Design a protein around this ligand. Structure first.
Ligand SMILES: CC[C@H](CO)Nc1nc(NCc2nc3cc(Cl)c(Cl)cc3[nH]2)c2ncn(-c3cnn(C)c3)c2n1
Lengths: 826, 248, 329
């Protein structure tokens, strides 16, 4: 068996959702920001936000909504987790003591159902009579909000429309009414139903179905003065309400997909809209009052306000202030002005909240020679693309290098005192036949630049037609100085050439240090790439020179240096190249038993292969023979996102389901088959998507640092900006920390009453297993924050093992010291 | 696709055993003894008639590729029965077949199994499988004797006498190389033909074509009487050579 | 000739790697040196010599050389290790069963989460499987281990049935004691949970219906670790075993012993309301408690869902692609 420890070094920073209301007091204006597994509560002031409380939940916050049922003084919070845990929460403050009450709790999961493509949708009735959930295709689940439903019991209503894009409860209806956009073979449609809690079924809805735009994405429920709904698409915005129909199709919105909406005026006069290029719009509802006294909707208008960060959620707070919640870039507070500035913008940035964004790749480098190590991450996407340099000093110091294009891979080359970074920027087919970039970015603002002239694929004769307005990716290698972080050079790759892999190394007897990039020729027609290049560059005297190129018949997904040789994965193949005295690459040997070898890691003469579906394989290079040998494979099927070698026997992997696992050689030589079987000995639901595993630590090493119980150090970056750390334990230290977890879980009160053991259970749509071999360090480190009565309650009847004293009782002060040392590994 | 498991009578003069100096009579005797050993061992163990026959067919085929002088018959027989039990889903443990072998064999005979009977048998399984070219499925005259008899309609007792007499002729034909000369379908017809002659029954009357004097042609196409007579001659020869007489 | 099996050596294949582990031997992917065709080699280890050549392999060899169908796995040949020269007693070399190599296995495709099935894809999948099952059932052979691990799919959309190790002949006229527990618990029929021991070919139909539902939900329908727990889950959806729906349930040895918590009513149509009507009817008939009321393979092929399916259009499922490697920002 294997024993490992996993802690968070940086909490998730990307904003997954945000709501406003009156949650902490019926009087205050609150902003509730949801990051993965984390809830932040703020109070709106005239300057900015005042933080008041933050809680973690043992789940991914999928639904977050505030509501106020009749009889309550203030808003209640409903949260649904991705494992289908429902809870109703209340804020309660007794002087200085702030706590969160779980008013109701339950699991809304069905034994049989198909998870919806557009994800869990959660909505609440304007009269707070019920909570609507769309968890499975063809089913609408209703939790009625009666006082007695403390178990959040619910029933399903059969829904004929299987493929639903979006749904909202409507305002101004005689019964609870849902308005939704759905997709069937004929197109997309908007339709209504009424929800009867008494009959537990749908009844005919208030207004007829209308055919809507093919890419109708979002449903806005318009408030009582107008009533009805607005439907947002790619090209048009439409209003529907019985007999009334409006449609505005301003050309400005066709340029970029709109992804978020918010209401500015409680009466529905003004809504905010945001798009994927970061533009912020105002949607205006022009009113017309009839002599009858009735208010109708005259027209819709769209006005461009300015630019924000690409925003997952928008929420207007008060006065001119808007909170921009960003998942791909830094979140913001921005002020909307009535008068435009001299550039024509009505948006001016107030504050910037650091978001490590998607961490696509990262490397640890000791820039200042400090024996510490700083973390340089490829963070963000598109305009929010950035390099982030992170050091420990008690908070983390983070520097941001704006790139305004997507960073893909990073590697450090000490010989050149610079970094190599792969990037891609979006250009659009323009009227010249070529392409034009939406904004200047790192690859275009390099000091010196070069463009590939390779003729490898030049024979072509394969037609790829271009239409005006279509997007294309343009890939570059950026040479970036390690002190100034100034773009020194940018090399543009071939048209339709994607850069997938990057290494810096010396090969063979060649004393030169090179940048090596592996690429793929990707054409929309191809299911899998069938052409590719391995390019050897030398950065010298401010210029990048192409040394050699090797044509391959696939995508070079991953390359790694192997004892002076180049190890590369081309589609199914894993190949080992030698670097000749003629400065050309020569194939030595191949391994083909892979479906798609996406990830590669080496230790000595051992190779760990990560596959799209076949989990991990342990290869070995056999130098006596000049070829590979399969050592052992994880036959359990998993979709890998990143892999890492812990030691000669233990191997770490990440699943696309937000799960971590550890495989070990079965170390029983009786039969050849046992040696050939990698057994999964560790299982752990991380709750994050791991993209990059990287050996290293951010802790300052003065050589005085006490030797911690933990051995080894693997950092990992995730899509939500979370940075974590994995390390190993001795059998004894594991048992001690494991037994302590079981004691802590009985003591610590969970938000929503979510069993910790459930939360960390390995979970795919198909399987659920109890966690094994992993210590939730974030639980262990919480021992230091629980009250003294609770600390002593935890240590009661706790015995140590395999130590100097075989059985040794624990006191509350002994464990405080142990955990405090465990907090020093990050 | 599939192998050819049928030879001409003339070809049996060139079996491995013959060319190593064994004369025709001895190989015939060795075949009867081995088959009957297989039959007797499996009957003591309670084995289905198909299981006995499959082993005997393996046995006969085997000695078309090997000589009796280099492969002891009783070991081969025991190995055939052991494999047959697995093929026909009537499995037996090898130790039990050996136990039964000792019960029926004298000391000179059991010397073939050497110092380790089970090993000599279990080791042969490899050669057996390669020899029979892993063609394990075998059809036997029994199923055809019953498939065809079911289509006869007439005196219940005269037809049952025909079947039992024919069935006995099938069991007796397992001691011969007929299993190697003619498909099982032909064997079933020949034994019906033989029993009909012996019981003085006219089988065409019981068929759906009572004026079709060559009654068998509706069961097995393209069989001349020449073949059925050659088979009958070979079956009755066993009775004449021995002391036993036709069952009637 | 092509028919003289057991003599050609495994030298004739370049071994690519170990695709899977079998209980008696490991299974490898190989390329034929002469033709280039990709195959899969199942190592039959007779070295154990506990009972000699494993019967499981004997069954799979015996049956598969009889069965010819586009939806049944084909055994190309049987080859051997370099045998010891003129010393069969010392020889301990193994035997390998050559099979056509298939691009994927369904358990792997579903578990990785890398496959999507449209209705038309499910139509092609089920039509092939049932046609194969019908071919076998008409030859009076029973699979008895129908799991997603034994369904193999090429990227073309062709489906083939694979592990025949637990397969045996079925005689309607003569019922004899068979092994009481043959199908994996998740795909096991109710009759074998109650231990009929004299089962019908309808046991294989039950498994395939479970697969049918799993193709729609993307999650196996009846997942439990214990035989009674399975009966409870089956009972909740298909209804509790009772004499009215299963006139002979009282004869099953474990009927009184094994009981669901309640006498649950059948809810299949309600819980699978999202399933199309043509398919839902097929599920209700395939997942019928009574083995005699449970539909046959032929009846599934003559259903509104599958009868008008043209196999000329095989409808390849949404299988992995390069974009699947990248993550949608
Ligand atoms: C036992 C292994 C798996 C278990 O599910 N089953 C299976 N998979 C095949 N191909 C699909 C496939 N590609 C793979 C590539 C890799 Cl890299 C990896 Cl690791 C596993 C892989 N799996 C196959 N082809 C013929 N047979 C076959 C051989 N004898 N029989 C009766 C059928 C097959 N059996």
């Amino acid at each position: 068996m294997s024993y490992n420890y996993v802690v968070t070094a940086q909490k998730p920073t990307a904003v997954n959702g945000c709501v406003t209301g009156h949650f902490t007091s019926a009087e205050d204006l609150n902003l509730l920001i949801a990051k993965n597994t984390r809830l932040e509560i703020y109070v709106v002031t005239a300057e900015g936000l005042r933080p008041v409380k933050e809680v973690g939940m043992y789940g991914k916050i999928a639904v977050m909504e505030l509501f106020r049922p009749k009889g309550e003084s203030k808003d209640l919070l409903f949260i649904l987790t991705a494992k289908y845990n429902a809870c109703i929460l209340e804020y309660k403050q007794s002087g200085e003591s702030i706590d969160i009450i779980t008013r109701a709790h339950g699991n809304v999961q069905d034994r049989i159902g198909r998870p919806s493509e557009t994800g869990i949708i959660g909505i609440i009735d304007p009269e707070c009579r019920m909570i609507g959930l769309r968890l499975y295709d063809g089913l609408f689940k209703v939790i009625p909000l009666d006082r007695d439903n403390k178990e959040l019991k619910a029933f399903n209503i059969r829904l004929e429309e299987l493929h639903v894009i979006d749904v909202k409860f409507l305002y101004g209806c005689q019964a609870p009414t849902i308005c939704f956009v759905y997709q069937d073979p004929q197109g997309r449609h908007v339709k209504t139903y009424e929800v009867s809690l008494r009959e537990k079924e749908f009844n005919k809805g208030p207004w007829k179905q209308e055919n809507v735009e093919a890419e109708a994405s979002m449903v806005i429920a318009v408030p009582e003065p107008f009533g009805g709904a607005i439907i947002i698409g790619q090209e048009s915005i439409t209003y529907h309400n019985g007999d009334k129909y409006l449609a505005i199709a301003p050309p400005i919105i066709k340029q970029s997909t709109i992804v978020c909406h918010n209401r500015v005026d409680p009466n529905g006069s003004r809504y905010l809209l945001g798009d994927m290029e970061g533009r912020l719009f105002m949607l205006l509802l022009e009113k017309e009052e009839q002599m009858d006294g009735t208010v109708t909707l005259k027209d819709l208008r769209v006005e461009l306000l300015g630019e924000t960060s690409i925003a997952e959620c928008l929420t207007y707070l008060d006065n001119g202030v808007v909170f921009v919640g960003s998942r791909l870039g830094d979140s913001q507070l921005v002020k909307l002005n009535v008068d435009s500035n001299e550039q024509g913008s009505y948006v001016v940035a107030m504050e910037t909240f650091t978001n490590l964004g998607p961490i696509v790749d990262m490397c640890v480098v000791d820039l200042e020679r400090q024996g510490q190590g700083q973390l340089v991450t490829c963070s963000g996407a598109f305009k929010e693309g950035s390099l982030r340099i992170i050091r420990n000093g008690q908070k983390l110091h983070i520097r941001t290098v704006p790139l305004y294009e997507s960073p893909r891979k990073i590697c450090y080359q000490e010989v050149s005192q610079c970094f190599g970074v792969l990037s891609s920027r979006i250009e659009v087919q323009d009227t010249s036949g070529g392409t034009t970039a939406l904004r200047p970015s790192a690859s275009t603002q390099a000091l010196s630049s070069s463009v590939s002239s390779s003729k490898l694929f030049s024979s072509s004769t394969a037609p790829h037609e271009t239409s005006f307005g279509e997007e294309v990716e343009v890939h570059n290698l950026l040479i970036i100085d390690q002190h100034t972080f100034e773009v020194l050079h940018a090399h543009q790759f071939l048209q339709n050439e994607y850069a997938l892999s990057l290494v810096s190394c010396k090969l063979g007897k060649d004393p030169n240090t090179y940048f090596i990039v592996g690429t793929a020729m990707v054409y929309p027609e191809e299911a899998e790439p069938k052409q590719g290049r391995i390019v050897v560059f030398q950065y010298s005297d401010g210029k990048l020179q192409t040394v050699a190129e090797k044509e391959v018949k696939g995508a070079v997904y991953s390359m790694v240096e192997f004892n002076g040789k180049l190890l590369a994965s081309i589609n199914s193949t894993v190949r080992l190249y030698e670097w000749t005295t003629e400065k050309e690459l020569r194939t030595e040997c191949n391994h083909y038993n892979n479906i798609m070898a996406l990830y590669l890691k080496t230790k000595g003469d051992f190779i760990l292969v990560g596959d799209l579906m076949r989990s991990v394989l342990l290869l070995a290079y056999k130098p006596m023979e000049g070829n590979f040998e399969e050592i052992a494979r994880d036959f359990n099927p998993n979709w890998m996102s990143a892999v890492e070698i812990l030691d000669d026997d233990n191997f770490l992997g990440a699943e696309n389901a937000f799960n971590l696992f550890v495989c070990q050689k079965d170390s029983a030589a009786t039969t050849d088959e046992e040696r050939q079987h990698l057994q999964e000995v560790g299982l752990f639901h991380l709750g994050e998507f791991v993209n990059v595993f990287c050996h290293g630590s951010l802790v300052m090493q003065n050589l005085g640092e006490t030797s911690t119980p933990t051995q080894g150090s693997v950092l990992f970056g995730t899509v939500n900006g979370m940075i974590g750390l994995v390390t190993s334990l001795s059998e004894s230290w594991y048992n001690l920390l494991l037994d302590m977890q079981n004691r802590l879980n009985k003591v610590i009160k969970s938000v929503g009453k979510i069993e910790h053991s459930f939360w960390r259970s390995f979970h795919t749509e198909r399987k659920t297993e109890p966690a094994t071999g992993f210590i939730d360090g974030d639980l262990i480190e919480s021992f230091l924050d629980i009250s003294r009565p609770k600390m002593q309650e935890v240590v009661a009847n706790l015995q140590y093992d395999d130590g100097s004293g075989m059985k040794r009782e624990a006191t509350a002060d002994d464990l405080i010291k142990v955990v405090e040392e465990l907090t020093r590994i990050h | 696709t599939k192998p050819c498991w049928y030879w001409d009578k003339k070809d049996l003069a060139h079996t491995p055993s013959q060319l190593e100096g064994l004369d025709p009579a001895t190989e015939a005797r060795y075949r009867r003894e081995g088959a009957r050993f297989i039959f007797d061992v499996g009957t003591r163990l309670g084995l289905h008639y198909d299981t006995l026959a499959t082993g005997i067919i393996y046995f006969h085929r085997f000695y078309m590729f090997h000589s009796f002088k280099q492969f002891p018959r009783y070991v081969t027989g025991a190995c055939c029965l052991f494999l047959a039990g697995k093929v026909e889903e009537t499995p037996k443990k090898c130790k039990d077949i050996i136990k039964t072998a000792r019960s029926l064999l004298n000391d000179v005979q059991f010397g073939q199994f050497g110092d380790d009977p089970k090993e000599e048998v279990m080791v042969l399984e490899r050669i057996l499988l390669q020899t029979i070219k892993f063609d394990l499925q075998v059809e036997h005259p029994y199923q055809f004797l019953l498939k065809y008899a079911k289509q006869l309609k007439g005196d219940k007792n005269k037809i049952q006498k025909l079947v039992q007499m024919a069935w006995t002729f099938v069991n007796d034909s397992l001691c011969t190389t007929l299993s190697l000369q003619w498909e099982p379908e032909i064997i079933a017809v020949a034994v019906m033909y033989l029993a009909g002659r012996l019981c003085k029954f006219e089988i065409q009357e019981w068929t759906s074509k009572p004026m079709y004097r060559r009654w068998w042609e509706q069961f097995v196409q393209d069989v001349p009487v020449d073949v059925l007579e050659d088979i009958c001659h070979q079956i009755l020869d066993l009775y004449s050579q021995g002391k036993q007489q036709m069952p009637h | 000739t092509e028919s003289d099996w057991g003599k050609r050596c495994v030298d004739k294949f370049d071994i690519i790697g170990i695709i899977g582990e079998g209980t008696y031997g490991q299974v490898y992917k190989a390329k034929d040196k002469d033709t280039g065709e990709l195959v899969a080699l199942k190592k039959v280890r007779l070295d154990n010599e506990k009972e000699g050549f494993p019967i499981t392999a004997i069954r799979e060899i015996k049956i598969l050389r009889q069965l010819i169908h586009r939806s049944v796995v084909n055994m190309k040949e049987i080859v051997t290790d370099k045998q010891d020269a003129l010393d069969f007693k010392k020889d301990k070399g193994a035997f390998y069963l050559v099979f056509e190599y298939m691009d994927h296995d369904l358990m792997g495709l579903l578990e990785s989460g890398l496959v999507h099935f449209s209705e038309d894809h499910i139509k092609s999948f089920m039509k092939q499987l049932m046609e194969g099952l019908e071919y076998c059932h008409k030859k009076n052979f029973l699979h008895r281990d129908i799991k997603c691990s034994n369904i193999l799919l090429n990227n073309s959309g062709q489906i083939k049935l694979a592990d025949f190790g637990l397969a045996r002949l079925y005689n309607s006229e003569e019922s004899r004691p068979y092994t009481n527990k043959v199908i994996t618990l998740w795909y096991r029929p109710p009759e074998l949970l109650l231990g009929e021991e004299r089962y019908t070919p309808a046991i294989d139909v039950w498994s395939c219906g479970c697969i049918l539902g799993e193709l729609f939900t993307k999650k196996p329908i009846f997942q439990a670790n214990l035989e009674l727990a399975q009966l409870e889950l089956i009972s909740r959806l298909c209804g509790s075993p009772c004499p009215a729906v299963w006139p002979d349930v009282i004869r099953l040895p474990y009927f009184n012993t094994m009981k669901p918590k309640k006498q649950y009513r059948r809810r299949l149509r309600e819980e699978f309301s999202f399933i199309p009507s043509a398919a839902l009817d097929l599920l209700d008939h395939m997942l019928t408690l009574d083995p005699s009321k449970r539909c046959t393979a032929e009846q599934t092929l003559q259903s509104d869902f599958l009868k008008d399916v043209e196999l000329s259009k095989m409808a390849p499922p949404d299988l992995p692609h390069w974009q699947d490697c990248h993550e949608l920002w």
